[PDB]
């Protein structure tokens, strides 16, 4: 037999950092939670039990913390680059590092109209991600997303049109419900290093909001024709604002909410035009996937 | 053998309200997970195989529906006081009601600085909770309740001067990072029926609103001498708010963030005042608990 | 204000322990999540900031793995009711101590027909529990459960007779799918101490799979009326075989696994005697309870 | 813009399957959870809102669960295969069907020494799963694995000779104990199509039945020098007892048991060949992984 391919490392590694603001009194907190994965010239510990090609996944866990440590950890696509950038300038062996993190939103409290100074809340189960892969003689490769993102439209939102066979029982319908749970992730241009990386540490921060931004703005004013199409529309506008990025891609459940005929009821009307109590489904779900790039 | 407790009904209810305003097209949306479990004479369903007593659940779940559709849904302490009266009210053998109720945040869209008609996002995880205890001639129970508010403070909680035996590791410390998940439930005075429950509906919101305020407020401007402290000083002000609240109960675990010594590695400082990375551990957690009320 | 009630303590302690029988070379392990939480003399933490009664839970997480070291861990009623009478005879002004038990399946894995000697599996996510009650003056009280016991039948379920109303839908059935999640408490005498619980340990055991065994037989066996019938039946028996205990109480979820009507689509033949394919519901889900004790 | 990608489909369909044997009166039952993704000709539903190309995830459910209907369900490698075959071959701007099934265990329970004819018992959460793509003109491409195996071993496992730098601080040790959850795929040669499926069925369960068999005895048996060596053994024998597999999957986190040094507290001996009571940790662990194809 033969190894075809390796990785190894820690996962679930949970970190926060504090900054202090001695002069404002101002404190700012990030937490996340990495994964770092190492590939290389490592078959052997497989196939000839020899432990001295491998880096130790707990002495992974201590580099993650040393780096946080002496590094900033924003914004994440950054720190990711220096944490996969040490493992493989560190061990000759050692030719690619995966890094992927988690940021976890805490959010500043505001007190009586006022930013406090030392208290988060965490205002939602959001989650900004990175996966960073950094390849020996391949430059940097960096995909952004945000998940977690749950929004829902009550109205303008429509489904009609569609292919109907003797498989079709769905009724079309020019009003529904839409809810969903976004994941958005942005692909960047390669990078040559850290250098490279380094110089465009802003538009981190902004592509990020940038694509929430749009994200929000296109599902609460555009009047879905399907899902399929709304989502088109963010990506387009998303690489229409950031050059750097190459692709984009848009993952999104359609989480449906079931009218309730009612009619047996005393003549209960609940459907259509008078629609006000829905059940949602837990499943099943449809998923649609779209992958936007330049043309 | 014989019975001597029994109860039964439907789980894990999901709802859906819309509300529209057709003069300013404005829409509000509710979105609820309900529980309904009923108590009465109905034991021969035990031991006789007696089904002629038993309501089935299949109509519990139908009789939700159908309540949402002809009441209001909000403020949930009034909607699950009409479905638990209704059970008690309408079947004779039944004689006690028991309504949970979870209401899932859908917070109106902010776009372009304005306030979105019909788009909504969950804006957390955080829950507002009811419990209805409806009990035939005995009136109505209501204990409405937070839940999944997930806080940190980064500075200015303590925990010194506990005691200190042969079992006792843990040093004291005048600076440690506080977090945790609230649960904050309040307990109203005992309410005839629905029209006194009618007659306080403005009370309900505002109450949840003050409770909310006071819990965040006190966390964040309280210097900590310890969780139980804190806590007691949230439950003080609620009670001191409104009146026709008789208890206040507070869950609170302390979700530790550990130090880590990075000293072993080119002497890096990293604890004390020099502390800047943490570990939060998952496991395990300090959990404390109180119940305040009216001296 | 006035501190009502208050109890504090560690949540999701994990341990692990290990026996070796230096004989035979069979080693055998223990794995369990517990959580303690104290009630006494207390009060002035909350309101003095007085942290000199408290215990730290930091501590009682010390204790338990102590505890654990020098005392068996098996049967876990034994166990914790040696680690509740620590804490109420170790300190003063504790006087109640609330131990709460998981026990997690670690089976031993047979390999060519021979049990391994250090090897285990985990054959399902069943759990053996305890919750043992320890107040200074007032004994032992001690619920012994077992939980997350997922079984289904495909036949011998019935459901016809029930109360029908203009809420009622749901169609009469001779035979249906019937699956459940187990839930089962025994609670046992109250016990004057740790002198008459270790009287009783080979009780505890044998109690446990009698329970096990009665309700896996007669479910599998009984062609049941109702799940409310059915239960009462598994109780009865459990409460016949073992004296010392008091009562028995059951929690049973239904859940739904709903005929599709496929006659749409070519007039395929897919309900009542032609039933093949199901949609198993994820919720709502009926929800009945029972505790039955002597007569 | 342009599409680079796209799928669209239903997640999350929950199947249930009776067999009635009329002349035994056994019954068998089995459980599966669905995804099904569509790919083609589709990219206008995205870029003109053109809905004529899009088969409503609505319909695939259907067509799912008529599929089961109309086939047998087992072994899960047939029956995806069947359902790809379907979408592709009756929808002419479709090219390409990706059928995700996990099948959750149902296993007949036993009642007194006899197997019992229509009961079952969820005697774990491992499941069987399958990935079934089906590419217009490129045939069938099966993965197939099992997941969620949890396993021990409390003694037999050492970590000696790995690289220690100044980021090392894990000690060498030779006997600790080894938890994991394995995840095992075994990748089959690509099949022409359904005719050639069918002729290999049986090899099917064999083949999971191997897999299974020989990660149990491998882990159990093998005086494990790390993780990845031990894994290697298993791909290894797999690969050598199936020639249809072209290559093997392990996906293995190493979930940690620390020893608790106790010596603090009356020179308790806890560590070492003293270790008796160990601290199960949630997080991190490490991930292992690797690919084992034919040399
Ligand atoms: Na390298
Ligand atoms: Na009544
Ligand atoms: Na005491
Ligand atoms: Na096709």
Redesign the interface.
């Known amino acids: 037999?033969?190894?075809?391919?390796?990785?190894?490392?820690?996962?679930?590694?949970?970190?926060?950092?504090?900054?202090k603001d001695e002069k404002t009194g101002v404190?700012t907190?990030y937490?996340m939670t990495v994964?770092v994965?190492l590939e290389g010239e490592?078959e052997t510990?497989?196939?000839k039990?020899?432990?001295?090609?491998?880096?130790?996944?707990?002495?992974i866990?201590?580099?993650i913390?040393?780096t946080?440590?002496?590094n900033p950890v924003t914004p994440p696509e950054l720190f990711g680059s220096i944490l996969g950038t040490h493992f493989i300038e560190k061990?000759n062996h050692i030719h690619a590092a995966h890094v992927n993190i988690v940021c976890h939103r805490?959010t500043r409290?505001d007190?009586?109209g006022k930013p406090?100074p030392?208290?988060?809340?965490?205002?939602?189960?959001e989650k900004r991600n990175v996966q960073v892969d950094v390849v020996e003689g391949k430059g940097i490769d960096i995909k952004s997303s945000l998940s977690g993102?749950?929004?829902?439209?009550?109205?303008?939102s429509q489904?009609?049109?569609?292919?109907r066979?003797?498989?079709?029982?769905?009724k079309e319908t020019w009003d529904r419900?839409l809810s969903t749970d976004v994941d958005a992730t942005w692909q960047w241009k390669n990078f040559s290093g850290l250098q490279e990386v380094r110089s465009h540490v802003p538009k981190f921060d902004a592509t990020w909001a940038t694509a929430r931004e749009v994200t929000?703005?296109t599902?609460?004013?555009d009047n879905s024709?399907?899902?399929?199409?709304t989502?088109?529309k963010m990506?387009?506008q998303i690489?229409?604002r950031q050059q750097l990025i190459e692709?984009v891609e848009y993952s999104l459940?359609?989480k449906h909410?079931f009218e309730?005929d009612?009619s047996?009821?005393?003549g209960?009307q609940?459907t259509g035009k008078n629609?006000?109590?829905?059940?949602?489904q837990?499943?099943?779900?449809?998923?649609?996937?779209?992958?936007?790039?330049?043309?």
Chains 1, 2, 3, 4 share one sequence.
């Not at 030392?118 to 189960?125: A, G, K, P, V």
């Not at 489904?159 to 292919?163: H, Y």
């Not at 837990?282 to 043309?295: A, M």
Request: charged letters at 20%; proline letters at 2%.
């Open positions: 037999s033969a190894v075809k391919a390796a990785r190894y490392g820690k996962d679930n590694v949970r970190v926060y950092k504090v900054h404190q907190v937490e994964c994965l490592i510990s497989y196939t039990a020899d432990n001295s090609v491998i880096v130790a996944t707990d002495s866990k201590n580099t913390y040393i946080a440590k002496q061990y805490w409290m007190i009586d406090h030392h208290s988060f809340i965490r205002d939602s189960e993102l749950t929004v829902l439209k009550s109205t303008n489904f009609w049109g569609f292919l066979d003797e498989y079709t029982t769905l419900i929000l703005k599902f609460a004013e024709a399907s899902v399929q199409a989502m088109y990506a387009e690489l229409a692709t459940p359609n909410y309730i009612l047996w009821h005393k209960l609940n629609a006000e109590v829905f059940a949602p837990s499943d099943p779900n449809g998923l649609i996937k779209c992958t936007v790039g330049r043309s």
